Design a protein around this ligand. Structure first.
Ligand SMILES: [Zn+2]
Ligand SMILES: [Zn+2]
Ligand SMILES: [Zn+2]
Ligand SMILES: [Zn+2]
Ligand SMILES: [Zn+2]
Ligand SMILES: [Zn+2]
Lengths: 84, 91, 89, 422
């Protein structure tokens, strides 16, 4: 049976707002839930292009009105504005 | 007492919590569980003809809960145990 | 209570994971249905004899392709061979 | 399908312009949070204090985070009147009155385009059902399946699609006769709009391939590769690290092997060299399973000296691990032989045992199978689309097929994208 949390353990560690993380989350570089940060810089290349779960949802895109190119959901603005 | 949240607090501060999530995640991903649970969900959606989260979750979760190999459950729970005894006096 | 905590910790990880998996499924179909009400799912002929949209193989002998450099049409089944002596000329 | 709630809230155009700041902020924070702070801050219930109770939610109005198994966020939503939380695991907005997620709303989904959404909705277009998965056939034009079958694998590759649709290349195709512009025309006339139908760009690719220029499909993969990278180097204005490329090819496909030679006899040490690779090459002996082929490629072999001990190991893994199974040989004189040994490949592949470790798991994304005689064969492609549906790409005949039947094939090329590290 269990009863009591080891006193030395409490002695080291275990003795409100989520909007407060924005300060360091901006200090912090892109992170992944599955792909470990440390093991990526060790077994993969620093410049590695990554996608979490590539087949999670269908590819998310929108088609330009006039050229009909399939635009990435992140290349749309810059494409309408000048390149089309 | 509330010594259920504090004991969870250590696991995280010691990086032993993510060690267990990942180990479990991995075992589940390889065993075609994640894939099989993702399909079970689509049955309920085409069958019960509904896309309501609460509605579909109530039928998938219990099934998807049995769907875990009794192997994985054991190794991963056993892994959990030997961590608690790192921060818990018996009695 | 040594095990009560374990099976708790496990059920917690398990449930968060079940709820995440399902949450993304209901989300995606919910979008598909709203976006394409007239949803045609992909046809599954149990013989591999029919298309994704259940069609017979074309058997293109008739099918031609207008070659840009030549002014003529070229049997589709012979465009690779045709370019290897149309472009070079 | 509705949740008039967010609809009501979106009537007030000052509310949506704030709801769309809190999501983008909750998403962002989720994508830039260290595992440790991502547990004790976004997956700790404010009430029960447990972490990963069920899914945990982040209030859209306040700063509260409430679990689900003890229905604490729901409580918070009735004890304070707040009905919108965001899921800690995925950034999905939950309506606690509707009691369901809010997908269908494009704005919420494409929230990063808020404050652009106007001239966006005007000048733009949701994909067109048929074309939404880029599922299409490629006519055969004279033993062109060694290309056709390889393009489908590329045209359905997560990294390559992202690259093409980001218009990364097209924004500066300095060149007409460009190979890379061609691939973009294929994607373009496959996911969008520009008898013999969606083929125009594929022809353009033949016409381009010619100015450069029969059996091997794996040769054509390497020909594609090289071009993507070559048109990238013209794109740069710069004069140039050492040989570290930023092009997708070397960012996605390139790994590197460790060549090690130990001398337990002579007195030199384990000389070691790091060698780059764009795909591994495996031998099909009586090695029924793919792990057996990798065991070999990784097993130690006495370095044979005619007037030691040597091993091959992976030093860096790629994002997309391409495996080419050797089905041909040059057996007696110059005889062209074929290997028909079926080898079973797994749906998820672990590489922890082949590095010079921590579980590193890949997902089977693409398959190219070979059929027939050596010099005069026929190539087929199998691609996995989001949702778990497989497709077979004969020539111009695209057709669904069960995973179980895809697992029973003469595997010539294998494409695995990285999925879980640790
Ligand atoms: Zn355009
Ligand atoms: Zn709670
Ligand atoms: Zn609140
Ligand atoms: Zn609601
Ligand atoms: Zn170009
Ligand atoms: Zn390069």
């Amino acid at each position: 049976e269990i009863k009591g949390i080891k006193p030395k353990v409490i002695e080291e560690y275990s003795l409100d707002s989520w909007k407060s993380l924005m300060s360091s989350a901006k200090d912090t570089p892109l992170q992944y839930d599955h792909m470990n940060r440390e093991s990526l810089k060790k077994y993969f290349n620093p410049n590695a292009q990554l996608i979490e779960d590539p087949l999670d949802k269908p590819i998310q895109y929108r088609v330009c009105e006039k050229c009909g190119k399939p635009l990435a959901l992140t290349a749309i603005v810059d494409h309408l504005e000048n390149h089309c | 007492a509330q010594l259920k949240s504090q004991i969870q607090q250590y696991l995280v501060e010691s990086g032993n919590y993510e060690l267990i999530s990942n180990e479990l995640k991995a075992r589940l991903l390889q065993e075609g569980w994640v894939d099989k649970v993702k399909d079970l969900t689509k049955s309920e959606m085409n069958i019960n003809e509904s896309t309501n989260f609460t509605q579909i979750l109530s039928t998938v979760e219990p099934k998807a809960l049995e769907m875990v190999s009794d192997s994985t459950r054991e190794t991963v729970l056993k892994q959990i145990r030997e961590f608690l005894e790192e921060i818990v006096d018996t009695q | 209570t040594i095990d009560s905590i374990s099976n708790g910790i496990l059920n917690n990880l398990l449930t968060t994971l079940i709820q995440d998996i399902v949450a993304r499924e209901t989300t995606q179909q919910q979008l598909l249905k709203t976006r394409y009400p007239d949803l045609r799912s992909y046809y599954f002929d149990p013989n591999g004899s029919l298309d994704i949209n259940g069609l017979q193989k074309q058997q293109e002998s008739s099918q031609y392709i207008h070659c840009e450099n030549c002014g003529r049409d070229v049997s589709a089944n012979r465009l690779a061979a045709h370019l290897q002596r149309c472009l070079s000329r | 399908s509705i949740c008039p709630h967010i609809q009501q809230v979106f009537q007030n155009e000052k509310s949506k312009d704030g709801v769309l700041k809190t999501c983008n902020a909750a998403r962002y924070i989720l994508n830039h949070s260290v595992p440790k702070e991502k547990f004790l801050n976004t997956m700790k219930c404010g009430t029960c204090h447990e972490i990963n109770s069920g899914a945990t939610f982040m209030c859209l109005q306040c700063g509260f985070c409430g679990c689900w198994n003890h229905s604490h966020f729901l409580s918070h939503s009735k004890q304070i009147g707040h009905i919108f939380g965001i899921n800690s695991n995925n950034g999905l907005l939950f309506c606690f009155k509707c009691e369901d997620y809010i997908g269908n709303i494009d704005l919420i989904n494409d929230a990063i385009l808020a404050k652009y959404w106007d001239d966006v909705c005007t000048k733009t277009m949701v994909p067109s059902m048929e074309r939404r998965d880029g599922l299409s056939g490629l006519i055969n034009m004279g033993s062109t399946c060694f290309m056709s079958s390889i393009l489908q694998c590329l045209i359905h590759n997560p990294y390559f699609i992202r690259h093409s649709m980001s218009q990364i290349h097209s924004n500066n195709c300095k060149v007409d006769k460009c190979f890379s512009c061609a691939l973009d025309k294929i994607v373009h006339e496959l996911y969008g709009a520009l008898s013999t139908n969606r083929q125009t760009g594929f022809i353009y690719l033949l016409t381009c391939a010619w100015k450069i220029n029969q059996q091997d499909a794996h040769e054509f993969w390497q020909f594609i590769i090289n071009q993507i990278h070559q048109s990238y180097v013209l794109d740069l204005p710069n004069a140039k690290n050492n040989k570290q490329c930023e092009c997708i090819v070397h960012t996605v496909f390139e790994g590197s092997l460790e060549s090690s030679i130990v001398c337990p006899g002579c007195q030199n040490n384990s000389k070691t060299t790091i060698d780059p690779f764009l795909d591994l090459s495996l031998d099909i002996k009586d090695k029924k399973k793919l792990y057996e082929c990798l065991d070999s490629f990784h097993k130690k072999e006495q370095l044979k000296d005619f007037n030691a001990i040597k091993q091959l190991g992976i030093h860096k893994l790629p994002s997309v691990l391409v495996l080419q199974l050797k089905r041909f040989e040059h057996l007696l004189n110059g005889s062209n032989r074929k290997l028909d040994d079926f080898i079973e490949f797994p749906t998820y592949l672990n590489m922890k045992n082949y590095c010079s470790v921590p579980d590193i798991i890949y997902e089977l994304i693409g398959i190219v199978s070979h059929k027939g005689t050596v010099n005069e064969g026929h190539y087929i492609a199998f691609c996995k689309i989001s949702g778990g549906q497989w497709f077979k790409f004969n020539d111009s005949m695209v057709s669904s097929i069960s995973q179980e039947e895809v697992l029973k094939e003469q595997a010539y090329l294998l494409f695995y994208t990285i999925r879980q590290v640790n």
